[PDB]
Structures are given as C-alpha cells and as structure tokens.
A paper describes a structure:
The pyruvate dehydrogenase complex (PDHc) links glycolysis to the citric acid cycle by converting pyruvate into acetyl-coenzyme A. PDHc encompasses three enzymatically active subunits, namely pyruvate dehydrogenase, dihydrolipoyl transacetylase, and dihydrolipoyl dehydrogenase. Dihydrolipoyl transacetylase is a multidomain protein comprising a varying number of lipoyl domains, a peripheral subunit-binding domain, and a catalytic domain. It forms the structural core of the complex, provides binding sites for the other enzymes, and shuffles reaction intermediates between the active sites through covalently bound lipoyl domains. In Gram-negative bacteria the E2p catalytic domains are arranged in eight tight trimers further associated into a 24-meric cubic structure with an E2p trimer in each corner of the cube with a 432 symmetry.
Author numbering:
A (entry chain C), B (entry chain E), C (entry chain D): 211 to 280, 384 to 630
C-alpha cells in the first residue's frame, strides 16, 4: 500500500485483471477507510503476476498486494421515542461512526475559541471574475473558485504566524512546529464533508491550485479520492458559503490547531470615512485550539487573513 | 579571486592589515575592472598571513592573493576643431573606453528593434504608496520603488516567454535557453550607469527584492559594488523615468537579447469605453535583438509586461 | 521549378503518385527555403512520367523535376551561463539562422530612421465595419481587415512619392526606381513572421485585396505558401496591432528602402479646434533607409499615408 497513516483499512474491490497491465498512477484497489473510500494508485507500469489481495481483504499498512512485470456525569436521556409517534432506528455507517468519534474527541480534548470576521472582497471578486473570463477566451479549461484565494491567504498567514502551523501531542505538552504548509479544503461529497489536503500551498500559484482543486473536488464527489490526498494537513478551510450561514463556529480538525470556516458573501455597506459604500463582505470564522493559540494570536491571524483577502496584492510582498 | 567572468582586472588597493582578521564577507581588495571597481568579499574569517597581492597588482582569475588563519567606409570626419573656437581634448577613462567598445560592438552585431508601450499603473502606484506607508508604521526600514514591480513583471514575462531568456553565440548560430531568471537594473552612479544583477527574481518577493535593490543601489553609487553582483544577467531594466524622456530606445546589453527601458510616469486620459478617465501611464520600451526574437514575439512580451504591471495581481496566478 | 529568386533550396517531400495526374495549379513538391517552406504549383495538367525529383533532393533553379502527359571590435561576451543556474543550449533552425543573418546584414548596411505617426481612422473603422456587415448579408464570404486599407494607402503613397518604391545596389551607388507596386504584408505563422507579397496593389480594389489576403494568410499559417507569393516586394507592412506595442521601430526589409509598422488602434482625444473629440488613432511608424530617403521625404510619405487613411476617400482622387 503506498500511503496510509497507519489505520487498518478494509478492501472493497480491485480494479485489475489477471494479465492486465496498469498505467503509471491509476486505480488498482479501493479500500474503505475513514472519511471516504480511497483508490490506491499505481507505483509503476507492468502486467499482473499476483492477486495477493482479493475482494474483501484487509490491510493495515505495507502489505504486498501486487507483483508486476515489465467525572461522573448523567447518562444519556432514556426516552421511549415510540410513545409519541412512529420512529425508524437507522444505524450509522462506519464512516459516520468514525467521524462522530473523532468529533467527540476533538470537542472534549480541544478548548475551542472562535473569532468571527468579515473581509472586503469586492476587488478580489472582480479580479476573480476577470481571470475566469480571461482563462476562458484563452482556452485554459480552468475555473477559479473563491476558495483558492482563501487557500493562498491562509498559506500566507501560516508563513507569517508559524504558531498556527503546529500540532500538540497526546498529553498536550510538546508542540510540533511544522515548516511545510498543506491545507485541507472541506469538499462536500454525497457522503458528507471529506477534507482533501493540498500540499505546499505557499509556493503554488492560484491557477495551479485551481486546477488541483477542480480535479480533487470531482475526485472526492465521485469517491475516487486517493490516500495521501487526505493526509498531512496543517490547516483546514471549511467553505459552506454556497449554502448560507452568515457565520458559523467550526470544530478544530485534530491534530491541527485551527480551522477557517467561510460563509456566504453578502453586499453590505462599509464606512469609507464619509459615506457607506456598498462592498462585498465575506464572513470568515477562525476556530482554534486555545491550548496552543491565545485570543490575541487568533486575532492577529484572522486579521492577517482579512488583510490578505481584502487586497490580494499582499500575496506578492 | 572569488568571481570574475574571466577578464584581467587591475588592483587599486587593499583593505586589510598585517595581523588583522577579516569578517565573513567584507572588503579585502578593490579591483578596477569594467563598468565599475569591485570590492572582493571575504570567503571566511581569519587573521592575515600573506600579502600575496599588493597595491597596484593585477589578476586575471583565480590567483592566490590571501592566506588566513583560524566593407570600405569613409573615415571619421577630419576637422580642425580649434579653428572655430577654443577646445579641450580630454581623454576618456578606461571604463568609458571599455563601455564605448562594448556599445559599438552591440550596435553592429545586434539588429535592434524597439517596441514602445504604455502601461496603466494607477493601481500599482496606489498600492506601492500604501505599502510604503504600511512598511513605515511597522518599522521595516524599506522603500519600495516602482522598479521592483517592473522586475517582477519582467521575471513573469521571462517565465511565460522563455525565448527572451536566451543568448546567442559568437557566430549567432546556437541559442542558449537559460532556465534561471536574473535581471540587471541600471543604477546611476556618478561614473555613469552600472548594471547590478539580481538573482532568481522569479522567486523572491517584492519586499526582499526591494531590500536587495536599496542595498545594491547604494553599494553602486558609493563604488563598493562587488563582483558577482554585476554578472550573470538574463535581462536588463534601464529606468530613467526619474529624469524624463517620455520614451527612449535603449541598446541591447549583450550577451542578452532584450532590454526594457522605463520612462517617466505621466497622468494621461484613457478611454474607459464611454469617457476619458485620468490614469497614470508609464511608458516602457522593449529593445531586443531581431536575430533571436521577431516583432511578434517582442509584441507579446511587452504586452505581457504591460498586462502584469497594469494589474499586478497577475503575479500570483 | 517555376519561380525561385536564385537560392539553392532543399526538397522536403513530393505531393504526387506514379500515374497520378495533377490539376492546373496545385501542390507537387514542398521545398524548404528561406522564410518558410514553399509548395511548387502546377504549370499544367497531365499524368506523371518522371520522378526526376525525389524526397530529399535539392534544386537551385530551373531543374527538370517532372514530365507529364496530356574595424576591430570586442568579441561577444564569453560567459559561463551555467554557473548561475541551469541552461539548455538549443540550436536555431535553418530559417532562424537565415533570418538572423539577413537582419544582421540589414542592420549594418542600412542607416535606419524611424518616423512615428498617428492616423485618425474613426471613419475608416466605421466604414470597414459597415462593409463587413454588407459583405455578410450579401453572402460574399469575405472579411475586410484593417490591413487592406493600409495596403491601399501605401500603394497610393508609392504612386505619389516614387522614390520610396526603389532599391539600392550592393555598393549603394545606383538606385532602381521600380514602376510596379507590390507590397509584402508580414503574416504571423507559428514559425515567426513571413512576408507574402501582393502584386499591383495600386490597381486592385479593397475586396479583391481582402480576398487575396484572407487566402494567403491561411496559406502561410498552414505552411503551403507558394514561391512567387513571397518575392518581388516593393514595400513591407508589419502589422502587430493585434498584440500591442503602441509604437515600434521595425527594420527595413532589404532590398527595399522602407517598412511601415502598424500598432494597436486606441481611442484618444483629438483637438477639433474647440474641444477634445474621442477619435480612434492608429499608430504607424515608417522605418526607412537614410541612404535613399531623407527625413523630409520620410515625413512627406508618412503624412501622405496618414492623410489617406484619415479620409479613405482620397483613394479615388
């Protein structure tokens, strides 16, 4: 298996045939882990020699699957839910159970603090529309979403405030200051929100990032999201602005220390000093772990993001 | 000698004492080559053992100077210039003679073509003033000149059109497509224009580049400009906008293939589609070698520069 | 071979079959000369008898290929371009080498002088749009570009000032006043700018010229540009207005004596005597050989072009 963080994953099916030869990096086996099922890519090209794995198998990590050729709280409220009407006791899927356990751990073990803010993105939206036009009449086949600008702004903010690109230990006594900047971006698949991770966001440009995002969003909404494309995230951006919620307080995505939720952009009046100009404010909200970061550092971080997205030219400085 | 392109340079004086110990990278010896006299830096720290070089010596390359411890055209018009008045036959300095020979070679051997253009830099100037304010009230001690934005725009244009980051041979039959992007920026010292080279402009940010430029401009205007800080340039930017010349046609700086001259920014009316808005147009002029580049490629290059400087946000894409 | 100016051209391939019979004037053989590869047309119709030429042959002029049936300057700067980064020493194609040699001869042997000018073409553009509409609803399948009006204006100017329709000798002592008016128009093929020549521009109308131009532009951009369609030019029009460069100084296309570069039309304010009316100015630039023409004659020529294109009705006078 090329890259699983160390969880025992149960196979669902395989992609190959006895005698088939596989391309450079394409699907061979789907395995149903956490978040969503992942398709192992190919390491190289070659015809099949081993069905060392089959349909229904299970691998924890680095197993040869293919050879080729080339205190005392009250209990939950016991209620007879059927005495008031008709019920239907559905049972949560395994990914739903796992996500619930992960969130119930992050809620207890992380002291959350949520700073809300609003970013004037009128210029950013005008520029994004202009670049979506220019990238059309030049036949690039790329769509620049408002999320890649936020990824760049958050990468800049992690460059300036490296305390936010950290992670605590089990006991919460040793920090892990990361020097790389990967950012997960919560994509909405029919099976809930999955977080694919984009690597080295601080270096890549907005068009390369936009191509990566346009690819991986579809890769997730289809279910073919490959492992390693959901591991090693330093930060999370949960954008639900396409649906509403003028603000919301997300949950920190352990083992990270912060998460930026993005809301629906709205045209609001802004005081220019003498009158109310109609600008387009985007409500962001930084929910962070209070053990690593304090209120002032969260304030400086979200105001760095606000300044960067307010005038995107600050990404070249 | 740490880095001379292979020219025999004559020493002027030394910077050290018998027994003195020198710092990491500071002056040891000044040598009067082409363009301007260069101060050899230190390779390391250590007390003096050899005055292997002295005052008045001459080195062509890699000489141990210190050991430490730790067809038929008409002739020129023969005129008796004194029969009309009083004259004074001054003789050109050695750097003036060398620069004249270099320019008289570049004029003959290079077919120049000069494309003029005007760039709407109203937004760029507003943003530069805003960042000069913000970099003051935050005590950065940096001054962001309009030239670093042009360096970034030219680096972007060399990324997009790599044919401009080239160099021809003696016979003009083999090109040398360079992959690095260094840009010389003509600084005006009391001894004329010297071109110091800034390396990897495509990667560095505008504030790092602005610090480099603020340092090396003074380093040149004082004369302490070190070698290697004037070698390996892929492009040249000759900015004379501080003096006038609404346009000018520079001479290609061999062995490069192009040079961008910059003129004085002026507030001109621009057709927005229905009226004349007063914008701030900066006149640029790309003078390039016709043997490598043709008129259409020069047009695309200067319009890439014009688009980048017109909306600097295109540096993040 | 029907028409090569006297250069030894190397064959690339043939267009026919043993037994095939060829039409009136269509492709038989492609030969890779200067500027671009040319397809020899047919002189007549008839079935094949000789493969007197083959694939890879070479002809200098009039060879039977088919029978049918029916002082001391400094050297170039020696730089080790790899000590600053990674390079890639590509070698120029044969057409690039030839064009570089031609331009490096024209630069030395021709004293260039470039007169810039701006032409009010508001009426001309309105009339061209009107005729493009009228030539559509009448099903002519012709597109009238702004370049045919410039060809007509330059033909008129060559009629009025016949000194510009000239050519010098090797020694530059005997002029050759041409009486015909052919005009090359620099078309932009993927292999650079090629100049196809349109004959007797002074007589043909704008719709016939527009059909010729629409045909030969595609003929060049595809590579099927036939010889004789790039020979015998009295003048050159290099139009790069589709790309930018508000002005540019082209290189005289020897053995001609002048060249008109055309830039991007822009809406500028023009003094009507009492106010600034927004007109559409087209920046032209006449670069001419100073040995034949002087500054005043160039001024009169470019002002004739400016007057003609300013009010195109002067083409009937």
């Amino acid at each position: 298996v090329p890259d699983i963080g160390g969880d025992e994953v149960e196979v669902t099916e395989v992609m190959v045939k006895v005698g088939d030869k596989v391309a450079a990096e394409q699907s061979l086996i789907t395995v149903e882990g956490d978040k969503a099922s992942m398709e192992v890519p190919a390491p190289f090209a070659g015809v099949v020699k081993e069905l060392k794995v089959n349909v229904g198998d299970k691998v924890k990590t680095g197993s040869l699957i293919m050879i080729f050729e080339v205190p005392g709280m009250l209990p939950w409220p016991k209620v007879d839910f059927s005495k008031f009407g008709e019920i239907e006791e559905v049972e949560l899927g395994r990914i739903q159970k796992i996500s619930g356990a992960n969130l119930s751990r992050n809620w207890v073990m992380i002291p959350h603090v949520t700073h809300f803010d609003k970013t004037d993105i009128t210029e950013l939206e005008a520029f994004r529309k202009q670049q979506n036009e220019e990238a059309a009449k030049r036949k690039l086949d790329v769509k620049i979403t408002p999320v890649v600008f936020i990824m760049k702004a958050v990468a800049a903010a992690l460059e300036q405030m490296p305390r936010f690109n950290s992670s605590l230990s089990e006991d919460g006594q040793r920090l892990t200051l990361k020097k790389y900047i990967n950012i997960g971006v919560a994509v909405d698949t029919p099976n809930g929100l999955v977080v694919p991770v984009f690597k080295d966001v601080n270096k890549k440009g907005i068009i390369e990032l936009s191509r990566e995002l346009m690819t991986i969003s579809k890769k997730a909404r289809d279910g073919k999201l490959t492992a390693g494309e959901m591991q090693g995230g330093c930060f999370t951006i949960s954008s639900i602005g396409g649906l509403g919620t003028t603000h919301f307080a997300p949950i920190v995505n352990a083992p990270e220390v912060a998460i930026l939720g993005v809301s629906k952009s709205a045209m609001e009046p802004v005081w220019n000093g003498k009158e109310f100009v109609p600008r387009l404010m985007l409500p962001i909200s930084l929910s962070f772990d209070h053990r690593v970061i304090d209120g002032a550092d969260g304030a400086r971080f979200i105001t760095i993001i606000n300044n960067t997205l307010s005038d995107i030219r600050r990404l070249v400085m």
